[PDB]
Design a protein around this ligand. Structure first.
Ligand code: A1Y
Ligand code: A1Y
Lengths: 296, 301
């Protein structure tokens, strides 16, 4: 149990860096362009790798020239791809990302290619003994709940010192995913999900959604410039102010930087308060740079 | 491989990777949306004309700037898919292979474009100097970096001076963008294509007005051509006779993107086949009109 595993998506981010967001029906030239390996679980593996944590990525990929770019990027970062669910049907998903250089805002137009998702069958083949931590990016909820029931069953047959710590991410405001609330030691709920459920702050969301988490779980909600908050079994609300850079240039994957940094800090035995703080610290650092290089 | 002497039609200009996404609604800044469909296409004027020439049955070559990388790889495989000779590409050690993001709102049909960056250098006169011209029977230049292209055109003129009339390379130029620097290109080539957009920005309200008002800018013996979409196209040569062909509209209009490039390549093809200017005008109108009722370039011939 020496590695952190992230189960989720790997998407090709085709990036255009603009000085201002284009008005509808307008024609504006971009400042610069780059291809970036994206996908939430995939971005968190980049961050975990830079933090010095051995990690593995599990997600669906389709053989082609794009997957060769993605795989070469994963390998250059030392991310283990041995668990990848290579598919025969479907193309590798790609997205057009417009990054506003003046405020760091990122607009994503995702092309979801109907690539078959990672299944409980794919997960059943995985050797759970090499993993210290397993993070699951909420996608195919019913099929992931089965992956989560499999980790819990393994845990019950293991000593407390050899148990696999589990984290879940509920980013999209999709009702199917609200069952995952639900499972795991740490539950990351997005600001978008929280707002969609009628909450105007991180503290409100935590108080209103805690009843949905597993006994003894920590519910975490980041709220951009408002920093981030956490709530555990003790009922004590924990807050961390954000660490915004003086110039916010790229927020693409900031939330993924936060999740990965919180997971790394907890996996290192640090307190929830310290982990919240470290999450905001690394995410804030990322926001003042293009991509993920130089975050540490 | 071995290209026979005076066998190819060369087009010099832009190649860009256009990523086109169809959306339910225009995305609001800082949001993550899912497009209805996404297409990766090879674009650019000279690039589109190259595809059309291959489909017409002509050996053709593309000359343009690319930087090694994944974008270039996609573009090279798309050129090769269309039988385009890619050996004259000006590879660049600095800059980005052009890529554009187009967003189409499915509801109103509006097109929002994030254009490629200006980082990649255009083909230069020194890059063009290194080209052995003997395998080309026709060279078409898309007006971009005018001062450098003027020298490319002077080089061809020099080459032609030393050749018997049967081994002279025919030349065409396209002034498509309403940019002042491009207007000096009107004085070069045997055939000059002027866009409706340029004509309008110069105050002309019809293809007849544009040709009459701009013919003085062309070199002796040149033919000035202007397509005006639904109004068809005109041509004017040294005899002073305004030639015209009506448009050949398709039953339903599907995709007009690259219709001007289809017209250009078809007029060039027809002229290179020894057909008259009137026959070339008609042929260009027919092929471009058929293209408009088709998605992309499949089945234009
Ligand atoms: C979108 C967004 C914008 C900014 C300015 C920050 C920062 N700093 C940020 N993070 C806050 C901490 O939690 C992770 C995200 N996210
Ligand atoms: C944009 C545009 C729209 C339409 C409907 C046509 C036609 N027909 C057309 N072409 C006319 C011939 O010359 C080339 C262009 N172009």
């Amino acid at each position: 149990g020496s590695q952190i595993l992230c189960v989720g998506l790997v998407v090709l981010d085709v990036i255009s860096l603009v000085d201002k967001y284009p008005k509808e029906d307008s024609e504006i030239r971009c400042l610069s362009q780059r291809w970036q390996r994206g996908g939430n679980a995939s971005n968190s593996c980049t961050v975990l790798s830079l933090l010095g944590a051995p990690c593995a990525f599990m997600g669906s990929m389709a053989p082609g020239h794009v997957a060769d770019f993605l795989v070469a990027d994963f390998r250059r970062r030392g991310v283990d791809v041995s668990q990848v669910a290579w598919q025969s049907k479907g193309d590798t998903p790609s997205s057009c990302c417009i990054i506003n250089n003046s405020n760091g805002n990122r607009t994503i137009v995702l092309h979801d290619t109907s690539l078959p998702d990672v299944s409980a069958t794919d997960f059943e083949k995985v050797d759970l003994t090499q993993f210290k931590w397993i993070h699951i990016e909420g996608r195919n909820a019913s099929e992931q709940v089965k992956m989560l029931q499999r980790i819990d069953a393994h845990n019950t047959r293991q000593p407390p010192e050899q148990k696999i710590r589990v984290s879940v991410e509920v980013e999209k405001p999709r009702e199917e995913l609200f069952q995952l609330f639900g499972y795991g030691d740490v539950v990351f709920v997005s600001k978008d999900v929280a707002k969609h459920l009628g909450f105007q702050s991180a503290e409100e969301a935590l108080r209103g959604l805690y009843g949905r988490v597993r006994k003894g779980a920590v519910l975490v909600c980041a709220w951009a410039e408002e920093g981030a908050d956490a709530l555990g079994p003790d009922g004590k609300l924990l807050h961390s102010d954000a660490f915004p850079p003086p110039r916010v240039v790229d927020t693409l994957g900031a939330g993924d930087t936060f999740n990965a940094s919180v997971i790394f800090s907890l996996s290192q035995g640090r307190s929830v308060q310290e982990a919240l703080r470290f999450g905001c610290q690394v995410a804030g650092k990322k926001c003042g740079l293009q991509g993920f290089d130089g975050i540490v």
